[PDB]
Amino acid sequence: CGIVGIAGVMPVNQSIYDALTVLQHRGQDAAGIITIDANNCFRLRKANGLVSDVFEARHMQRLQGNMGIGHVRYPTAGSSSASEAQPFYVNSPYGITLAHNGNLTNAHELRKKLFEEKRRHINTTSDSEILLNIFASELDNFRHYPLEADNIFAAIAATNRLIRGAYACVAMIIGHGMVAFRDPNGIRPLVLGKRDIDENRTEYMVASESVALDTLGFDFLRDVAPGEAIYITEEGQLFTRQCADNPVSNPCLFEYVYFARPDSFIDKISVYSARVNMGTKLGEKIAREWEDLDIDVVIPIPETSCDIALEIARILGKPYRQGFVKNRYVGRTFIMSVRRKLNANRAEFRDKNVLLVDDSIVRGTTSEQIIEMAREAGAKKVYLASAAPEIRFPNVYGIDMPSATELIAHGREVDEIRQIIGADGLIFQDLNDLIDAVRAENPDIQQFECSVFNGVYVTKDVDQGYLDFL
Amino acid sequence: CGIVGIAGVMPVNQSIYDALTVLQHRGQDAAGIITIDANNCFRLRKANGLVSDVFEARHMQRLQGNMGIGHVRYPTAGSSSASEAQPFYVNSPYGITLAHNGNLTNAHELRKKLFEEKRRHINTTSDSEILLNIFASELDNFRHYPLEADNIFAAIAATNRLIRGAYACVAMIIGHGMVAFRDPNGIRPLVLGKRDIDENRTEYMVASESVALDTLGFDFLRDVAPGEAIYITEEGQLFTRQCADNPVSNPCLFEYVYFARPDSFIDKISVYSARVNMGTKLGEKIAREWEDLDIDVVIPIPETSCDIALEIARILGKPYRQGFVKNRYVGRTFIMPKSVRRKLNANRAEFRDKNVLLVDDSIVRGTTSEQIIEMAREAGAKKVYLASAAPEIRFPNVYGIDMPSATELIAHGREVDEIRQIIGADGLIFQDLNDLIDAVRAENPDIQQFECSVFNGVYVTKDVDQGYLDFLDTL
Ligand SMILES: Nc1nc2c(ncn2[C@@H]2O[C@H](COP(=O)(O)O)[C@@H](O)[C@H]2O)c(=O)[nH]1
Ligand SMILES: Nc1nc2c(ncn2[C@@H]2O[C@H](COP(=O)(O)O)[C@@H](O)[C@H]2O)c(=O)[nH]1
Ligand SMILES: Nc1nc2c(ncn2[C@@H]2O[C@H](COP(=O)(O)O)[C@@H](O)[C@H]2O)c(=O)[nH]1
Ligand SMILES: Nc1nc2c(ncn2[C@@H]2O[C@H](COP(=O)(O)O)[C@@H](O)[C@H]2O)c(=O)[nH]1
Ligand SMILES: [Mg+2]
Ligand SMILES: [Mg+2]
Structure with a gap:
């Protein structure tokens, strides 16, 4: 409100x-x-x-x-x-x-x-x-x-x-x-x-x-x-x-x-x-705990994460590209799912290992589907980074x-979440990190x-x- | 359509x-x-x-x-x-x-x-x-x-x-x-x-x-x-x-x-x-023809220019910050006995005591640009420079x-500097048609x-x- x-x-x-x-x-x-x-x-x-x-x-x-x-x-x-x-x-x-x-x-x-x-x-x-x-x-x-x-x-x-x-x-x-x-x-x-x-x-x-x-x-x-x-x-x-x-x-x-x-x-x-600061810290976390990761580009999931992902790319010294476009108008479905909200720019995923950046993951539905979209656009490995800590x-x-039951993180370890959402890798922001940010x-x-x-x-x-x- | x-x-x-x-x-x-x-x-x-x-x-x-x-x-x-x-x-x-x-x-x-x-x-x-x-x-x-x-x-x-x-x-x-x-x-x-x-x-x-x-x-x-x-x-x-x-x-x-x-x-x-390419070209054009200009940040004018400005920042090695936010919902202005601020809002902190290079996709009548520039000045901007991803529309x-x-086109019958003046920009620069075509x-x-x-x-x-x-064959 x-x-x-x-x-x-x-x-x-x-x-x-x-x-x-x-x-x-x-x-x-x-x-x-x-x-x-x-x-x-x-x-x-x-x-x-x-x-x-x-x-x-x-x-x-x-x-x-x-x-x-x-x-x-x-x-x-x-x-x-x-x-x-x-x-x-x-x-x-x-x-x-x-x-x-x-x-x-x-x-x-x-x-x-x-x-x-x-x-x-x-x-x-x-x-x-x-x-x-x-x-x-x-x-x-x-x-x-x-x-x-x-x-x-x-x-x-x-x-x-x-x-x-x-x-x-x-x-x-x-x-x-x-x-x-x-x-x-x-x-x-x-x-x-x-x-x-x-x-x-x-x-x-x-x-x-x-x-x-x-x-x-x-x-x-x-x-x-x-x-x-x-x-x-x-x-x-x-x-x-x-x-x-x-x-x-x-x-x-x-x-x-x-x-x-x-x-x-x-x-x-x-x-x-x-x-932006949440970006810096999350970039830094990825860089600490994922140093051995191979990604070709950082892709934000619009809108919230647009400048966050840019920062993450800076920190990781990787390229930032706009792989998803948020539909400015969404129409209803009549009684005659994320695709209606987002569109994947095919050229930015084709034969690339990508790191997608999202503000949060509440239920996991969007995240899973966004990941499927990336795979269907030609992406090899798809990694997900959440700007906010787990929501439990x-x-x-x-x-x-x-x-509480609707919350995917509720009672589930990061890996169990990573599996359910089908990401090759999943990483959340540390609560302490978000706080400092x-x-x-x-x-x-x-x-x-x-x-x-x-x-x-x-x-x-x-x-x-x-x-x-x- | x-x-x-x-x-x-x-x-x-x-x-x-x-x-x-x-x-x-x-x-x-x-x-x-x-x-x-x-x-x-x-x-x-x-x-x-x-x-x-x-x-x-x-x-x-x-x-x-x-x-x-x-x-x-x-x-x-x-x-x-x-x-x-x-x-x-x-x-x-x-x-x-x-x-x-x-x-x-x-x-x-x-x-x-x-x-x-x-x-x-x-x-x-x-x-x-x-x-x-x-x-x-x-x-x-x-x-x-x-x-x-x-x-x-x-x-x-x-x-x-x-x-x-x-x-x-x-x-x-x-x-x-x-x-x-x-x-x-x-x-x-x-x-x-x-x-x-x-x-x-x-x-x-x-x-x-x-x-x-x-x-x-x-x-x-x-x-x-x-x-x-x-x-x-x-x-x-x-x-x-x-x-x-x-x-x-x-x-x-x-x-x-x-x-x-x-x-x-x-x-x-x-x-x-x-x-993106348009930004590259325009960045390079700014770097050639403006070199002696002092700016502290590149700020896009949403939404078109967001990635274009990002590239212009890359080329100029200057920081990129989001100084303007586009209102997602605009409403009717009733007639009780179209303002740019109704469409855009300036993030005060990003302008305060800084020289800015604002990047916009184009200038048609010039009104927007003018008002956007005022917005930047009111937010504490020292000098405000405007870059147009598109050549002059005449x-x-x-x-x-x-x-x-064509009478409404500000570029119609006007030199770059006359437009700059009319829009109150400290500096104004357009993309080269040739550069955009190559882009x-x-x-x-x-x-x-x-x-x-x-x-x-x-x-x-x-x-x-x-x-x-x-x-x-008549006049
Ligand atoms: N994300 C997104 N951008 C859009 C959509 N429709 C048009 N655009 C972009 O919106 C811009 C509108 O220009 P503006 O006046 O907002 O700078 C154009 O550059 C156009 O590509 C849409 O549904 N989603
Ligand atoms: N937290 C939250 N996210 C929302 C809401 N509406 C749309 N979203 C988008 O959906 C994401 C959460 O999706 P979920 O994982 O629940 O399917 C968030 O990143 C956000 O960008 C909302 O009302 N609350
Ligand atoms: N530019 C713009 N961003 C907005 C507006 N209202 C909300 N936002 C941002 O839109 C995001 C919406 O989340 P999304 O689900 O699109 O990732 C939030 O991070 C919120 O700050 C608006 O009127 N204009
Ligand atoms: N060319 C063009 N720009 C538009 C339109 N509606 C909104 N805009 C925005 O207005 C700017 C041109 O403003 P003007 O100089 O006409 O006041 C463009 O940069 C664009 O973002 C439209 O219908 N055509
Ligand atoms: Mg989101
Ligand atoms: Mg514009």
């Missing part, structure tokens, strides 16, 4: 659509935008589909207002993918809407408490409707009107004591403004930016990625700190206050590996640069990973959230119980 | 859609597919839009048959871009449909003759409806049923005598089969492939690009020769026959420069490799590449001459220059 929120001094409908389009890689199952018009009323458009399919002119026309949020949803299986989309809304207290990227690990416990204590009905399976409600109930506690920044921060604080997991949220309160907050372990991404229209007017915005500020011409200010909350009034006044008991930066590693765009700077780290555990913080870009980040690679969940509240429940 | 045709022994509806999705880069203005059912009747579906948007399940469900053709229309300005899409169809003789990529230079002359001579009404501006009518009238001249291959071939040859220009065409004749033919100068691309099923059951297909064959698992057989024609009967028999008086290979240079996919082999040339392509009017040629020396009208103003076909002289 991806989120954006603008606190402008002029129409934001187009800007949000535009920010959501550069954040579309984070989710295409559904999209939604909601603003607050001059009458302090919410205007909302949300449906399944791409951003470009969801918002038509009639819809934009209706999304009037100078403050608003948007959300693109990654088809989180389980949560219907045909279920109600975000942003979510509640009429009381005040009027609240919230968009969120992440996942609560105590969602069940939360909806039960909400039902018992507050009588708040949760219509969906989305733990975001849950978050919105916890946050709403905390704001229900205040008497005087309007709430003051502290009240709002106290509510976020109270909320953080209750919910557990990963989350980057942006929300809006009728008659008050916009609030954006981030979980205590700083897992899911969120950045703040601003745009001065003139000497006295300044707009603010937050997004899951810096690309969204970039495309709108907002100047990047900084990442929102772990546990921190930001409250921008309808008058453009900004407030920030730490709302978690023990904030620590454990940014998701996978954002760097695959999930995030290369032109984004998450937690001071350039995704591109980190990615599930992510429960907002990256939708297949079931990314860490090198900002050494103040000591630890990352790497549950998918090592079964260690920073929130320390995961066991087979939650897993099996899923 | 892009075309595909498949004479199969099993439903082709999915296979055509799949071939059109890999040919989508050739036109996204509209699409159309048309097959022949068991009852020897055409089933068609054409609308404006992307392949993915045009063909819904109800439509596919209706496209029954084992033979069909498809088309993806590049928004040809002038031809409405909201006009009737191809493939086109006529009920007589026999029942004919034709999909076409290219351009007729004597279209005006052609609809006049058709009206006058045969009373054939042309309902659109598409010279493709023209081409379908000429071919239809010529086939009309035959008495015995069915026509034999030679009759069809005779028809095509007759047609080639009449029309003038560039064209790759696939067509179908009810009760007969599929035909495909290419112009006498071999300009517009067309290839043939097959997919064997058994002891004699073999399917054939033609497409504007080998990628369509690859993706469908057809074995690449070969390009269709200039002026050649191909006829596959409904039974699976393949006939081929030269139908031009003086066939020559003058393939479009711009297909190699930009238009075609890198994984396609047009006229024995690999587009990728041709492209003329209009009247053969099938939609180029904006592509190096891949298949049998090609002695390309179609380069956009760059050299030399119109390979007959009627373009003769008519220049007819013009000056």
Whole structure:
């Protein structure tokens, strides 16, 4: 999922659509935008589909207002993918809407408490409707009107004591403004930016990625700190206050590996640069543990791995060539597999021992089939290098990973995987290597959230119980 | 535009859609597919839009048959871009449909003759409806049923005598089969492939690009020769026959420069490799003519130039970094009471306090280039140099590449330095036509001459220059 929120001094409908389009890689199952018009009323458009399919002119026309949020949803299986989309809304207290990227690990416990204590009905399976409600109930506690920044921060604080997991949220309160907050372990991404229209007017915005500020011409200010909350009034006044008991930066590693765009700077780290670095280290590993290997060229499996493979070729002093081309358009198969996504440039494989480079291997299907494609194009020996370490555990913080059994690496040794996928050789990046590759870009980040690679969940509240429940 | 045709022994509806999705880069203005059912009747579906948007399940469900053709229309300005899409169809003789990529230079002359001579009404501006009518009238001249291959071939040859220009065409004749033919100068691309099923059951297909064959698992057989024609009967028999008086290979240079996919082999040339070569040459040209220039990195302008710039970096021994990212999804900009940044984003870190050499495939109107350069300056770039993989574009392509009017061409009537100034580049350098020709040629020396009208103003076909002289004979 991806989120954006603008606190402008002029129409934001187009800007949000535009920010959501550069954040579309984070989710295409559904999209939604909601603003607050001059009458302090919410205007909302949300449906399944791409951003470009969801918002038509009639819809934009209706999304009037100078403050608003948007959300693109990654088809989180389980949560219907045909279920109600975000942003979510509640009429009381005040009027609240919230968009969120992440996942609560105590969602069940939360909806039960909400039902018992507050009588708040949760219509969906989305733990975001849950978050919105916890946050709403905390704001229900205040008497005087309007709430003051502290009240709002106290509510976020109270909320953080209750919910557990990963989350980057942006929300809006009728008659008050916009609030954006981030979980205590700083897992899911969120950045703040601003745009001065003139000497006295300044707009603010937050997004899951810096690309969204970039495309709108907002100047990047900084990442929102772990546990921190930001409250921008309808008058453009900004407030920030730490709302978690023990904030620590454990940014998701996978954002760097695959999930995030290369032109984004998450937690001071350039995704591109980190990615090149993963190349350097992986090249070096191949060079250590595979010195006696005979390959004629390095071939990247587009897109992620394109610059990673180039680096690997540099390190190995071997030639880099584009053997695969990713189809820019993919059509559906009607009820009347990787080949529909990729095409092998025959001339680059014919009678060559090749080293293919991929960002990861989740299930192994793609990898096996890509390898078959190489063999069919004339390749003698086909070796596979994964820019990311083995993926053996599930992510429960907002990256939708297949079931533990679906993970080919799950319970299988590299060789057993190499065999199943039919590669002549298979090599993965060392977790420690990937860490250093990314860490090198900002050494103040000591630890990352790497549950998918090592079964260690920073929130320390995961066991087979939650897993099996899923 | 892009075309595909498949004479199969099993439903082709999915296979055509799949071939059109890999040919989508050739036109996204509209699409159309048309097959022949068991009852020897055409089933068609054409609308404006992307392949993915045009063909819904109800439509596919209706496209029954084992033979069909498809088309993806590049928004040809002038031809409405909201006009009737191809493939086109006529009920007589026999029942004919034709999909076409290219351009007729004597279209005006052609609809006049058709009206006058045969009373054939042309309902659109598409010279493709023209081409379908000429071919239809010529086939009309035959008495015995069915026509034999030679009759069809005779028809095509007759047609080639009449029309003038560039064209790759696939067509179908009810009760007969599929035909495909290419112009006498071999300009517009067309290839043939097959997919064997058994002891004699073999399917054939033609497409504007080998990628369509690859993706469908057809074995690449070969390009269709200039002026050649191909006829596959409904039974699976393949006939081929030269139908031009003086066939020559003058393939479009711009297909190699930009238009075609890198994984396609047009006229024995690999587009990728041709492209890389373009970098080599341009690198070397920069090294000769610029030597005293200080740059810190080579940065491509996605997507075409990515590998070209890589080579230019190699030759210049300068580092290559990805300073621009192409947005994968662009949306509508509504009209509430086309920006380059809507298409591209600059990776700030890669420009900050550096002198950059930006490599782009070409400069048409100059707007993009100008704005891309501003983007580089705003990202902290000190000096910004622009390299064009293609020579200066100063003329209009009247053969099938939609180029904006010659007034819009920034290169039209301007010196390199005047363009550099207009685009705000610290330095500007173009590829040499001769170098680019060698660059592509190096891949298949049998090609002695390309179609380069956009760059050299030399119109390979007959009627373009003769008519220049007819013009000056008035003023
Ligand atoms: N150039 C470009 N890359 C993108 C865009 N959105 C996502 N990406 C990158 O695309 C990759 C997609 O992975 P793939 O499956 O193509 O290897 C990810 O590494 C992601 O960073 C986009 O809009 N433009
Ligand atoms: N990877 C890939 N490249 C494509 C596809 N279709 C066209 N292209 C390339 O996209 C480029 C588009 O040019 P651009 O304006 O993006 O630089 C052309 O060089 C063309 O070869 C496709 O489906 N996949
Ligand atoms: N991890 C991941 N990879 C994806 C996704 N969609 C496409 N891919 C591509 O598929 C590869 C994983 O393929 P698998 O081995 O699961 O069949 C990745 O390298 C990536 O480029 C996605 O949603 N998640
Ligand atoms: N020649 C050409 N370039 C196009 C087209 N659509 C996008 N482009 C991109 O735009 C550049 C030309 O931009 P112009 O100078 O016309 O503003 C090319 O380098 C190419 O990447 C098109 O239809 N034709
Ligand atoms: Mg991959
Ligand atoms: Mg370009």
